[PDB]
mmCIF file of N, CA, C and O in Angstrom:
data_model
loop_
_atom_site.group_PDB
_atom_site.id
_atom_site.type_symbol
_atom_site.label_atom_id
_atom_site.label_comp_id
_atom_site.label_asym_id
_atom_site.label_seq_id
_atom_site.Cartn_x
_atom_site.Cartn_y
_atom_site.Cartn_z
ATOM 1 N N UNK A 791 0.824 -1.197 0.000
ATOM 2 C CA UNK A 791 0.000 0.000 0.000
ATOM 3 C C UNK A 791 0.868 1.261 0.000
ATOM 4 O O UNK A 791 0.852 2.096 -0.904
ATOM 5 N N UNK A 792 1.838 1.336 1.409
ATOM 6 C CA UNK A 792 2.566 2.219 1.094
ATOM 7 C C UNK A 792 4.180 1.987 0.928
ATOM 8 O O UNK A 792 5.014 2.504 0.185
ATOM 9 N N UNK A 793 4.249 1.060 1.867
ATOM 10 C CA UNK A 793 5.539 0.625 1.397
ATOM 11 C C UNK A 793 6.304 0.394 0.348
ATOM 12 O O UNK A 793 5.652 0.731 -0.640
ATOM 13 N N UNK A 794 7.604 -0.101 -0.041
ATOM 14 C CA UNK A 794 8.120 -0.269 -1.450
ATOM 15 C C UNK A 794 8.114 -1.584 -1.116
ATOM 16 O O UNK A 794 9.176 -2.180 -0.937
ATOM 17 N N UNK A 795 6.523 -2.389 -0.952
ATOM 18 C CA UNK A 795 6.734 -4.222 -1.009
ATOM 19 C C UNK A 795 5.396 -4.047 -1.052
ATOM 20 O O UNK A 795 4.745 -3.494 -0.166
ATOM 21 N N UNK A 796 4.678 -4.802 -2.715
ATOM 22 C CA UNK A 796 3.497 -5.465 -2.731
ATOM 23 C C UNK A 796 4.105 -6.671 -3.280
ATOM 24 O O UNK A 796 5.258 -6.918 -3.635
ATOM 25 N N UNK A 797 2.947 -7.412 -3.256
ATOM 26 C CA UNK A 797 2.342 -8.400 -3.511
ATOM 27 C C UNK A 797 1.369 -8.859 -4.899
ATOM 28 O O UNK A 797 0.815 -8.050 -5.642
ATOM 29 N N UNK A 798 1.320 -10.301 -5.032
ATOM 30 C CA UNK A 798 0.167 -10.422 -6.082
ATOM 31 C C UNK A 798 -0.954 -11.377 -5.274
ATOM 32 O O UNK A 798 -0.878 -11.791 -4.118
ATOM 33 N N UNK A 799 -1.866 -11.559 -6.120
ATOM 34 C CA UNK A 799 -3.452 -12.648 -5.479
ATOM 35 C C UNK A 799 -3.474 -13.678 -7.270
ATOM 36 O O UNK A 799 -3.306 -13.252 -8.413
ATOM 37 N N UNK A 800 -3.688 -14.754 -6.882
ATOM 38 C CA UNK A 800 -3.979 -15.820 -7.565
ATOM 39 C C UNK A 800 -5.558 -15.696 -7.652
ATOM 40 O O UNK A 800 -6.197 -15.073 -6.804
ATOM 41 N N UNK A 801 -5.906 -16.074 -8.297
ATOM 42 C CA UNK A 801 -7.584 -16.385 -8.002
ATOM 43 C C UNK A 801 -8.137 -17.885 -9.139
ATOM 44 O O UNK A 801 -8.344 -17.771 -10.347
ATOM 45 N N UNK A 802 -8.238 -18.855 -8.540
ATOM 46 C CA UNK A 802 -8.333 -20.102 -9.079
ATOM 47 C C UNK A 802 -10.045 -20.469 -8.795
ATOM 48 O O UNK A 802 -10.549 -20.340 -7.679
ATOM 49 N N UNK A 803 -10.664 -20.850 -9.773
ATOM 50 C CA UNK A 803 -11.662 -21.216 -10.127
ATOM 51 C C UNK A 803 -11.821 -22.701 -10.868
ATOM 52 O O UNK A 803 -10.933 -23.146 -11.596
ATOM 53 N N UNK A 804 -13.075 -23.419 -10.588
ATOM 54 C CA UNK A 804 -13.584 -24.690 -11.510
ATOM 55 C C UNK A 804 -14.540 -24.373 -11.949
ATOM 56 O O UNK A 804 -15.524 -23.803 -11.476
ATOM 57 N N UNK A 805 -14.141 -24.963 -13.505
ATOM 58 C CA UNK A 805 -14.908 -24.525 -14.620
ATOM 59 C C UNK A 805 -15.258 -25.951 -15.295
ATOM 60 O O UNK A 805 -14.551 -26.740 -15.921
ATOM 61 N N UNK A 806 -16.826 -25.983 -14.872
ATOM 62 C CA UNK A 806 -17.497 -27.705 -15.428
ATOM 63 C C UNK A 806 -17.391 -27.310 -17.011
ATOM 64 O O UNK A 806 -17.371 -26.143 -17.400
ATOM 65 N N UNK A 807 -17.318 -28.608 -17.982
ATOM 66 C CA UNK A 807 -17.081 -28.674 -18.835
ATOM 67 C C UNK A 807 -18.809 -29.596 -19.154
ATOM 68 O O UNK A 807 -19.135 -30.771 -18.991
ATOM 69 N N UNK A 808 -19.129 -29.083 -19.365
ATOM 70 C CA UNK A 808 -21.340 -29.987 -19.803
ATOM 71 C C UNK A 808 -21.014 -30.535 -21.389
ATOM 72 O O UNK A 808 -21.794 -30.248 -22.298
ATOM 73 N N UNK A 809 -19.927 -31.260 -21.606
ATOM 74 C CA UNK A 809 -20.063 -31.803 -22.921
ATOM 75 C C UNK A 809 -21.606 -32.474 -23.636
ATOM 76 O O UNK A 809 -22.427 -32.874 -22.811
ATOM 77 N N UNK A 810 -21.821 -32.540 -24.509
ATOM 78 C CA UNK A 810 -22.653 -33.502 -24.888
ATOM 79 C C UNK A 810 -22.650 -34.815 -25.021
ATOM 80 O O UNK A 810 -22.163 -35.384 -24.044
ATOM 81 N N UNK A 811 -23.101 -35.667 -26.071
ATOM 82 C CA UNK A 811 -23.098 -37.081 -25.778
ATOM 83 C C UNK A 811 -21.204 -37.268 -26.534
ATOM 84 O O UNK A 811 -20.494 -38.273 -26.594
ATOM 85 N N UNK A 812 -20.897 -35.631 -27.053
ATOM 86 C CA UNK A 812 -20.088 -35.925 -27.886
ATOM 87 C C UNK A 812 -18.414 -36.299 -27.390
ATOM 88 O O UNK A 812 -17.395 -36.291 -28.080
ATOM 89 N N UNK A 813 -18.572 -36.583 -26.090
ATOM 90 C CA UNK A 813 -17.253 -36.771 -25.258
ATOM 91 C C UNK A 813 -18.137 -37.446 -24.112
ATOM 92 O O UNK A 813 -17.625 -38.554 -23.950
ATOM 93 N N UNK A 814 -19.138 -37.323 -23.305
ATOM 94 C CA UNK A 814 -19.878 -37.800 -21.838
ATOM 95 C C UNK A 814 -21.124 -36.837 -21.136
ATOM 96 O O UNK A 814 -20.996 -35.984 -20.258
ATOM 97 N N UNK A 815 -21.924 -37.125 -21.589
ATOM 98 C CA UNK A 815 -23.321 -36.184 -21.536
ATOM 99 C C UNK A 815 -23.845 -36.808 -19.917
ATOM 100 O O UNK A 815 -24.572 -36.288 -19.071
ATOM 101 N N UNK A 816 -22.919 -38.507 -19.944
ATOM 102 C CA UNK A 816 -23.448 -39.377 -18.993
ATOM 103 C C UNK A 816 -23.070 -38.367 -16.934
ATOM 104 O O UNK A 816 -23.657 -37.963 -15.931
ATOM 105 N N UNK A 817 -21.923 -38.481 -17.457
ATOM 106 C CA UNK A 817 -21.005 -37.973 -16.706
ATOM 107 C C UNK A 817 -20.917 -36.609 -15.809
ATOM 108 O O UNK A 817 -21.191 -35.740 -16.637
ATOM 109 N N UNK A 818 -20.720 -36.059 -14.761
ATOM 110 C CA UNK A 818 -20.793 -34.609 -14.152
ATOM 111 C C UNK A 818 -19.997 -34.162 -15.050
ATOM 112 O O UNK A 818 -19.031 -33.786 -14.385
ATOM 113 N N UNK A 819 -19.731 -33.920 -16.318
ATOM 114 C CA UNK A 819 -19.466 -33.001 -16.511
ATOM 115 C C UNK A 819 -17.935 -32.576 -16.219
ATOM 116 O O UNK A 819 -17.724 -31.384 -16.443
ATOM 117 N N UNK A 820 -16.833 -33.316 -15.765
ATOM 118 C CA UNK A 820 -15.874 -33.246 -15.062
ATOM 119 C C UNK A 820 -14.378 -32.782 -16.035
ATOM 120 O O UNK A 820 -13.771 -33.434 -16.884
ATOM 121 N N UNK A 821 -14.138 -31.443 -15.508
ATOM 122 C CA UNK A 821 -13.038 -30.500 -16.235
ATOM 123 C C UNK A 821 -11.450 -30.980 -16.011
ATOM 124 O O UNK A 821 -11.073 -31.298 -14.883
ATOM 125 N N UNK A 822 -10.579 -31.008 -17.118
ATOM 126 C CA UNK A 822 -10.074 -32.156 -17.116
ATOM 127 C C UNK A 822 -8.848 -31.264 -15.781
ATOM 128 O O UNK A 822 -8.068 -32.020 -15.201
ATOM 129 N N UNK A 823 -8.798 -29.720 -15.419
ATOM 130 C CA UNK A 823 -7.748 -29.691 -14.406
ATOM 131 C C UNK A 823 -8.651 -28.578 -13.803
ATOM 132 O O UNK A 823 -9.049 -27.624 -14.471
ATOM 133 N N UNK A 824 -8.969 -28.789 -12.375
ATOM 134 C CA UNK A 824 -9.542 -27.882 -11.890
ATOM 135 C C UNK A 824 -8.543 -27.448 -10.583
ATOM 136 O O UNK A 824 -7.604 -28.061 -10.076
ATOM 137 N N UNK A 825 -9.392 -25.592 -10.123
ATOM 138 C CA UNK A 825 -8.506 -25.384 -9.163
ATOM 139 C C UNK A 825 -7.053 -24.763 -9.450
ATOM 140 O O UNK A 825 -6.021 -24.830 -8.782
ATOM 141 N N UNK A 826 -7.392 -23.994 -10.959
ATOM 142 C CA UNK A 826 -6.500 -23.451 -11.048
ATOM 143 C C UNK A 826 -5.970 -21.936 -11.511
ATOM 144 O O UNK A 826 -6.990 -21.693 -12.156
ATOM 145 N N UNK A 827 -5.257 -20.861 -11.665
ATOM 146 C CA UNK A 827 -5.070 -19.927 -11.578
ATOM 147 C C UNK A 827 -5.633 -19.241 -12.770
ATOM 148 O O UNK A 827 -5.290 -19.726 -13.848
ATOM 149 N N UNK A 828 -6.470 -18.158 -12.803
ATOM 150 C CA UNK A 828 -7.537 -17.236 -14.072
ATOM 151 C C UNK A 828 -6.072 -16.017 -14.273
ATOM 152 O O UNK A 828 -5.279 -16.041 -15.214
ATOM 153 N N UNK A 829 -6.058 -15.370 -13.501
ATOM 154 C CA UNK A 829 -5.234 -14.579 -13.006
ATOM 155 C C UNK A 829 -4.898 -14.035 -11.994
ATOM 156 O O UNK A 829 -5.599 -14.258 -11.007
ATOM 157 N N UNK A 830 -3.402 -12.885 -11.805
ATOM 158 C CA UNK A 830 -3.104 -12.069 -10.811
ATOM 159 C C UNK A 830 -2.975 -10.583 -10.306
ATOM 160 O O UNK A 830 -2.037 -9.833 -10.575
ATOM 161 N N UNK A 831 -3.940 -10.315 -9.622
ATOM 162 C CA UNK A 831 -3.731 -9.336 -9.149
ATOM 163 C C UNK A 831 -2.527 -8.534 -8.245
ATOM 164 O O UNK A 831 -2.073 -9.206 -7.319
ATOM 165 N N UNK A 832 -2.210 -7.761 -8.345
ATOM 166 C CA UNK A 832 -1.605 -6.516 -6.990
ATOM 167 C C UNK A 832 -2.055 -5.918 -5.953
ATOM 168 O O UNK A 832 -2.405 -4.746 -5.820
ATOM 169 N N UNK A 833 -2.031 -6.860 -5.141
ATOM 170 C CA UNK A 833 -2.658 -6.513 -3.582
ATOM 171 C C UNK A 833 -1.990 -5.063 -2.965
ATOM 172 O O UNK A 833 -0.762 -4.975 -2.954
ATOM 173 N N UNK A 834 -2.609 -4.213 -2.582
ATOM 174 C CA UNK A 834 -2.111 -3.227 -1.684
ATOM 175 C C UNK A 834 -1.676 -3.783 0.194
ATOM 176 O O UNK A 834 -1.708 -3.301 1.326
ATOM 177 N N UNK A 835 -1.241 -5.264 -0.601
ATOM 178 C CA UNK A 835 -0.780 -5.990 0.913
ATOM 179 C C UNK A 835 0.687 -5.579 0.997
ATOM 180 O O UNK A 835 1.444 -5.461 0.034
ATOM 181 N N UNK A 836 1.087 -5.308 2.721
ATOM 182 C CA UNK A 836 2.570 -4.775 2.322
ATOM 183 C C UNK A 836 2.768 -5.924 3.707
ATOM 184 O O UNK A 836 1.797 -6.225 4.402
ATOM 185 N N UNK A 837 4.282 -6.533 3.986
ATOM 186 C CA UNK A 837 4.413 -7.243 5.371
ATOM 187 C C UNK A 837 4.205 -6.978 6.584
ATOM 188 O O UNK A 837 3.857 -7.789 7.443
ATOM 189 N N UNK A 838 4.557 -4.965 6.834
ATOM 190 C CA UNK A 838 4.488 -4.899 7.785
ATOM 191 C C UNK A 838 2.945 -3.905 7.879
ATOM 192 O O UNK A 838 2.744 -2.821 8.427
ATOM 193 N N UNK A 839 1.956 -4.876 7.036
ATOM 194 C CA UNK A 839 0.397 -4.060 7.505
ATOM 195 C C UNK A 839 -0.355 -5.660 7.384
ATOM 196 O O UNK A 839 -1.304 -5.844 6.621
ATOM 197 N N UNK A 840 0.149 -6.621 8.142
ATOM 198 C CA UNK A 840 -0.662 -7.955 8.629
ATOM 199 C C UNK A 840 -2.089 -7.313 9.839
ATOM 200 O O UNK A 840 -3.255 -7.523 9.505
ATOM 201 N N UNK A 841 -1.830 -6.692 10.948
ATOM 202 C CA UNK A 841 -2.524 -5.913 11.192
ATOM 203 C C UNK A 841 -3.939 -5.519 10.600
ATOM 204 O O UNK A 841 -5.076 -5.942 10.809
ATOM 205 N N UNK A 842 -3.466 -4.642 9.862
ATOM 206 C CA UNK A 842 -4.410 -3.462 8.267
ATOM 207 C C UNK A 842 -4.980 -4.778 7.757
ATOM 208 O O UNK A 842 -6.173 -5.080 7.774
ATOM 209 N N UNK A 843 -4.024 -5.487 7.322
ATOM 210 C CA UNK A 843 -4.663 -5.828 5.936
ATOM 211 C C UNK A 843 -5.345 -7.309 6.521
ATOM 212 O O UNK A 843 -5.927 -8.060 5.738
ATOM 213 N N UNK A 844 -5.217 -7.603 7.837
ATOM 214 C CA UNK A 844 -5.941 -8.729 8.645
ATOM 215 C C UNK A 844 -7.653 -7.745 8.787
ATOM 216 O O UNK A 844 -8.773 -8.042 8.371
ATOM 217 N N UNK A 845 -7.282 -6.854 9.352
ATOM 218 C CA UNK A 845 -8.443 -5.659 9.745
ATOM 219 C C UNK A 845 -9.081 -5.382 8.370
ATOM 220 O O UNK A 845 -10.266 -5.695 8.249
ATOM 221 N N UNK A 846 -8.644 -5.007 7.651
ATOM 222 C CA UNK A 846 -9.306 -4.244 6.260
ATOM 223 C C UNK A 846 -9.972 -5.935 5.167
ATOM 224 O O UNK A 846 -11.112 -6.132 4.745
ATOM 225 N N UNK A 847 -8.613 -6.922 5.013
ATOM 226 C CA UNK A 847 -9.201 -7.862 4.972
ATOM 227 C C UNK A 847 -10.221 -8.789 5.840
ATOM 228 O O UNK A 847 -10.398 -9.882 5.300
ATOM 229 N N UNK A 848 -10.774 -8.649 6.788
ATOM 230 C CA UNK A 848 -11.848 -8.960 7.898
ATOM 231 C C UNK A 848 -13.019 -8.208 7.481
ATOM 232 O O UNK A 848 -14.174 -8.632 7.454
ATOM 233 N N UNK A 849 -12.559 -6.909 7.119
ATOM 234 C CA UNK A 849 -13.739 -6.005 6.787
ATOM 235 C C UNK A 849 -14.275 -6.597 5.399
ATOM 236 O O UNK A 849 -15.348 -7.182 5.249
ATOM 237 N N UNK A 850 -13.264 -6.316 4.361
ATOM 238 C CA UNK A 850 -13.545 -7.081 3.171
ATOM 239 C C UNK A 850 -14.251 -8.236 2.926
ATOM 240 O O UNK A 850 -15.156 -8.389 2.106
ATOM 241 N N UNK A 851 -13.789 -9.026 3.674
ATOM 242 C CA UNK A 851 -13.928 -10.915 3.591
ATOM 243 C C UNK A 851 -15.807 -10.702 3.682
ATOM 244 O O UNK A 851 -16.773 -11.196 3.100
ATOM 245 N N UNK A 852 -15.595 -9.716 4.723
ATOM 246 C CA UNK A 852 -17.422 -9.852 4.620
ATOM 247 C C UNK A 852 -18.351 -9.216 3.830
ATOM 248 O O UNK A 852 -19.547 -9.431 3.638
ATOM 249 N N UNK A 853 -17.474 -8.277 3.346
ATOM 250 C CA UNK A 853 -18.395 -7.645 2.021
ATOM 251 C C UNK A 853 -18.267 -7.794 0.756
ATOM 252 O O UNK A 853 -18.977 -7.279 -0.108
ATOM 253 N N UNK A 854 -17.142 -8.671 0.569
ATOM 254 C CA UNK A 854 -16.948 -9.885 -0.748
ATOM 255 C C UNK A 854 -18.091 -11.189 -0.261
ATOM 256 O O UNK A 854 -19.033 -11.558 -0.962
ATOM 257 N N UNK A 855 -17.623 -11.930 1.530
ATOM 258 C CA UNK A 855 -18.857 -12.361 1.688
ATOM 259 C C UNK A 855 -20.081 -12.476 1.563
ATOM 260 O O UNK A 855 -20.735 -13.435 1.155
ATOM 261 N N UNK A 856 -20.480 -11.238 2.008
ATOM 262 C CA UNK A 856 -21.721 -10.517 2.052
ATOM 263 C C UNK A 856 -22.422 -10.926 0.293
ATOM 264 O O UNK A 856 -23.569 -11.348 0.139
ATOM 265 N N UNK A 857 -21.537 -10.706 -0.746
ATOM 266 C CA UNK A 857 -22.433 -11.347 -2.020
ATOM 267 C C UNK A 857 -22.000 -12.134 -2.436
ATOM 268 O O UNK A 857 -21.913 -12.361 -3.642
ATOM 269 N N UNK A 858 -21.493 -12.958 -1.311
ATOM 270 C CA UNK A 858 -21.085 -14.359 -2.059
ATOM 271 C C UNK A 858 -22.512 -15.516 -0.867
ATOM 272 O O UNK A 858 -23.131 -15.307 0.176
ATOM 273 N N UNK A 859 -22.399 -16.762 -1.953
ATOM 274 C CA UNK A 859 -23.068 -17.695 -1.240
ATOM 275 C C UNK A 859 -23.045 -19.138 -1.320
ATOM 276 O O UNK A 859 -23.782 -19.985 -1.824
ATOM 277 N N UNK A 860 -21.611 -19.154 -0.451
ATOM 278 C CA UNK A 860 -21.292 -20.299 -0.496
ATOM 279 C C UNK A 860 -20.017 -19.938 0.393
ATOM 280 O O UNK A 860 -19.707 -18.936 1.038
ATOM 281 N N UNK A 861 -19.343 -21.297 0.136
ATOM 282 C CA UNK A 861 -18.251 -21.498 1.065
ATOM 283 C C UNK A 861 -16.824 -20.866 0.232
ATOM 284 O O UNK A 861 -16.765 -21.202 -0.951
ATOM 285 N N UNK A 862 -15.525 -19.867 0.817
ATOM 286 C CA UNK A 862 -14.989 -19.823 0.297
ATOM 287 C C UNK A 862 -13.431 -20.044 1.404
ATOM 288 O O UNK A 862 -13.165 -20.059 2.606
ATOM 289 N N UNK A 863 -12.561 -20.219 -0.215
ATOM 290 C CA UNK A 863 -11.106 -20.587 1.068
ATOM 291 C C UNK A 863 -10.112 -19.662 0.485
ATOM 292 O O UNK A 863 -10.191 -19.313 -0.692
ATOM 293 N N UNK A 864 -9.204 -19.268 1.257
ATOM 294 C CA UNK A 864 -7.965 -18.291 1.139
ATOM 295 C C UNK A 864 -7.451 -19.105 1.948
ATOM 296 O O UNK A 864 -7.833 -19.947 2.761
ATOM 297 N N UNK A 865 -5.835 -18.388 1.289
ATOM 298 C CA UNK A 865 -4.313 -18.575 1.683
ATOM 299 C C UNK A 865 -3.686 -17.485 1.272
ATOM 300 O O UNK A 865 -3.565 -17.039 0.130
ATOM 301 N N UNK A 866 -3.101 -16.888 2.797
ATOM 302 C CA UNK A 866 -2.147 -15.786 2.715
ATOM 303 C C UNK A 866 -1.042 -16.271 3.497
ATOM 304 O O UNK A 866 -1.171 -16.668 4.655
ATOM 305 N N UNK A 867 0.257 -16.234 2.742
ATOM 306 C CA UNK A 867 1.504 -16.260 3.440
ATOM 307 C C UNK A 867 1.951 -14.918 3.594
ATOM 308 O O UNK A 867 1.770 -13.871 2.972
ATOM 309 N N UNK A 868 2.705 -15.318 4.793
ATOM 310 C CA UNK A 868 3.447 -13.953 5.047
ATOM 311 C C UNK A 868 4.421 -14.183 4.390
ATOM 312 O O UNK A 868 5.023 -13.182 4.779
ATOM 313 N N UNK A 869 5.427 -14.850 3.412
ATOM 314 C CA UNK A 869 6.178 -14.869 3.085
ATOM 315 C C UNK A 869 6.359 -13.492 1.358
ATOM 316 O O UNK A 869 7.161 -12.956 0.594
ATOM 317 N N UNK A 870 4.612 -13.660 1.785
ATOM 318 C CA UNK A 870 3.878 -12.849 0.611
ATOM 319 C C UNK A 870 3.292 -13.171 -0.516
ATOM 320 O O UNK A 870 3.315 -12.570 -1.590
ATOM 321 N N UNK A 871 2.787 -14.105 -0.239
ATOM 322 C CA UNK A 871 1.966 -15.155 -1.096
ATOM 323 C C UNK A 871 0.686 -14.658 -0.933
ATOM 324 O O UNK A 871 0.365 -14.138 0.135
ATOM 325 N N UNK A 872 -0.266 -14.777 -2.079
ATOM 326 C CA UNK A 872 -1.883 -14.299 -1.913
ATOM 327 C C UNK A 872 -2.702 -15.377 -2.755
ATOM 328 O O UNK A 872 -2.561 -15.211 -3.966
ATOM 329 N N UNK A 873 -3.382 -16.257 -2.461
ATOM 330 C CA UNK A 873 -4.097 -16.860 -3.067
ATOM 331 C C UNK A 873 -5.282 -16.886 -3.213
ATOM 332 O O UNK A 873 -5.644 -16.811 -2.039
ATOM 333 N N UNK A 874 -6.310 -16.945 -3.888
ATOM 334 C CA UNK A 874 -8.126 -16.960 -3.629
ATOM 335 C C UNK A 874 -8.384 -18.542 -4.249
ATOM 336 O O UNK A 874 -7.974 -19.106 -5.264
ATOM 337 N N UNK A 875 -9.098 -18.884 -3.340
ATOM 338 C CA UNK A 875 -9.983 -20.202 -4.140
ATOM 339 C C UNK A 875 -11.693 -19.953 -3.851
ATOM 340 O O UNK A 875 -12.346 -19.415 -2.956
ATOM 341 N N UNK A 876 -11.912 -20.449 -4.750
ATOM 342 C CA UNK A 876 -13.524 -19.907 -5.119
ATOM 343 C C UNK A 876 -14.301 -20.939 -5.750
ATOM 344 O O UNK A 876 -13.793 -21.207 -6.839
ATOM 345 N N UNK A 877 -15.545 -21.776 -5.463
ATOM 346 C CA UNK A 877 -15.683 -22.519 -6.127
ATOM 347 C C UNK A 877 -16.312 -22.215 -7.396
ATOM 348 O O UNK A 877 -16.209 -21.071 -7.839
ATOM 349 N N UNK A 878 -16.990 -23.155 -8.072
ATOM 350 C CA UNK A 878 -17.543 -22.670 -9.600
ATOM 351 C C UNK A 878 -18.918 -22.307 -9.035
ATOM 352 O O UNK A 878 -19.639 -21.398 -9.449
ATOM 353 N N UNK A 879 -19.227 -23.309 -7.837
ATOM 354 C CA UNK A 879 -20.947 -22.494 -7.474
ATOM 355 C C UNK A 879 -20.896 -21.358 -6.824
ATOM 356 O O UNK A 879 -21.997 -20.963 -6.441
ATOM 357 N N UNK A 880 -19.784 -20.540 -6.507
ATOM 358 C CA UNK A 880 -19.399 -19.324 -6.341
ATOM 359 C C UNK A 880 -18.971 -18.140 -7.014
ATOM 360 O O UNK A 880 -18.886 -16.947 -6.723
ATOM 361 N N UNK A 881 -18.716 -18.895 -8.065
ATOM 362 C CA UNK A 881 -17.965 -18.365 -9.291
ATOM 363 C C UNK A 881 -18.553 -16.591 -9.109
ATOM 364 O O UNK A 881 -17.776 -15.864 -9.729
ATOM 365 N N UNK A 882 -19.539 -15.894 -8.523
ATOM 366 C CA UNK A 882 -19.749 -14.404 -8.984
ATOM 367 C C UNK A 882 -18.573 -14.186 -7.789
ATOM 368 O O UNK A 882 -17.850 -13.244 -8.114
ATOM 369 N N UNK A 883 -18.147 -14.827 -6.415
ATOM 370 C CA UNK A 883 -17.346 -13.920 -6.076
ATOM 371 C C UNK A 883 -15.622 -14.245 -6.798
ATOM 372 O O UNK A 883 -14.506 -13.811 -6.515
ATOM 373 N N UNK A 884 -15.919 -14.802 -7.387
ATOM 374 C CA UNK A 884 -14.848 -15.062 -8.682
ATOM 375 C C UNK A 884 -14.345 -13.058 -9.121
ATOM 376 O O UNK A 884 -13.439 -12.249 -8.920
ATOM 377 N N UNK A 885 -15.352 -13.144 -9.633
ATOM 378 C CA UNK A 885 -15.880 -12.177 -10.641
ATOM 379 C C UNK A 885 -15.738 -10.439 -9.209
ATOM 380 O O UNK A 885 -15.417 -9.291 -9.515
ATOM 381 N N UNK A 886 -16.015 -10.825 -8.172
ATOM 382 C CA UNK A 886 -16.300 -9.962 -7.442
ATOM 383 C C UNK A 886 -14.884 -9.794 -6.489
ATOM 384 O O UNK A 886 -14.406 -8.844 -5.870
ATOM 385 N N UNK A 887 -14.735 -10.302 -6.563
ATOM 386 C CA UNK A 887 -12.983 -10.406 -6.207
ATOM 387 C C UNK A 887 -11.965 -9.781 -7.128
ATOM 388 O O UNK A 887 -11.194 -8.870 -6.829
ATOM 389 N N UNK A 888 -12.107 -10.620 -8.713
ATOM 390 C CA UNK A 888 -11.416 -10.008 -9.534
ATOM 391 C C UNK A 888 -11.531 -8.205 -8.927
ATOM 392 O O UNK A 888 -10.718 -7.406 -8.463
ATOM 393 N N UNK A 889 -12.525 -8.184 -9.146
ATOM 394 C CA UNK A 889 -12.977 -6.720 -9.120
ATOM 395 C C UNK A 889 -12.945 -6.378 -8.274
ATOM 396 O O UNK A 889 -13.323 -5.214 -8.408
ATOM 397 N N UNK A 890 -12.624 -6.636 -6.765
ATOM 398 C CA UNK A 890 -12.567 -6.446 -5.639
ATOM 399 C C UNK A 890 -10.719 -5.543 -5.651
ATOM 400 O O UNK A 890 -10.220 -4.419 -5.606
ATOM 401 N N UNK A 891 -10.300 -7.101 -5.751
ATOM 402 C CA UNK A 891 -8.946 -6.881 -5.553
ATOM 403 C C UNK A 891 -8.363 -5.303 -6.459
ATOM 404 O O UNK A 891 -7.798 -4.340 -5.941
ATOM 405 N N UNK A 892 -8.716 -5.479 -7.834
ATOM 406 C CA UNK A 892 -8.515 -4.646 -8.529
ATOM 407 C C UNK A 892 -9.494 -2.974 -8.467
ATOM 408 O O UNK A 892 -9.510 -1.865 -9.001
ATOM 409 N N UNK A 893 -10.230 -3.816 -7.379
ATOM 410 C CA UNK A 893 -10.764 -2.173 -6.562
ATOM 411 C C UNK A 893 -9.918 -1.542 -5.917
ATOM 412 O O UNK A 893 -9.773 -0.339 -6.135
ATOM 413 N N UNK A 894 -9.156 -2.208 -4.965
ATOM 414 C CA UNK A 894 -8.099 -1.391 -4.008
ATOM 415 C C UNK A 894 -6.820 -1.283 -4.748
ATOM 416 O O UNK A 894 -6.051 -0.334 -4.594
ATOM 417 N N UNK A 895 -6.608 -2.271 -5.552
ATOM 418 C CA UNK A 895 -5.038 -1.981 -6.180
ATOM 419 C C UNK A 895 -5.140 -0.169 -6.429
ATOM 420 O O UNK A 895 -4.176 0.447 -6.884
#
């Protein structure tokens, strides 16, 4: 944010594949690699605002929450790692994240 140390965010999504009879119509539908990275953002995360960005992310989590509906999982290292996982029946806070994250950048 202010420091001279950001960060990036992963944001990994599953994306069903509904073939027809023309590969498995039988089948869920099952994508051949899921759980994996759309793209990355630039977090205004810096190391020494775990604090802030615990606080601001707490605040966030619930108003990315707030229109999401379903279950979601993160991973933040302090080493400075940012990850989002999101499922596909979640997929708008996919979308709301993208746009989230790239709200505060």
């Amino acid at each position: 944010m202010s420091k001279s140390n950001t960060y990036r965010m992963l944001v990994l999504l599953e994306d069903d594949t509904k073939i027809n009879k023309e590969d498995e119509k039988f089948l869920k539908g099952k994508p051949g690699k899921m759980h994996e990275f759309v793209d990355e953002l630039i977090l205004p995360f810096n190391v020494d605002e775990l604090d802030e960005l615990n606080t601001w992310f707490d605040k966030f989590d619930a108003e990315i929450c707030i229109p999401n509906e379903g279950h979601i999982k993160y991973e933040i290292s302090s080493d400075g790692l940012i990850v989002l996982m999101l499922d596909k029946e979640i997929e708008e806070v996919v979308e709301k994240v993208k746009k989230f994250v790239e709200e505060n950048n």
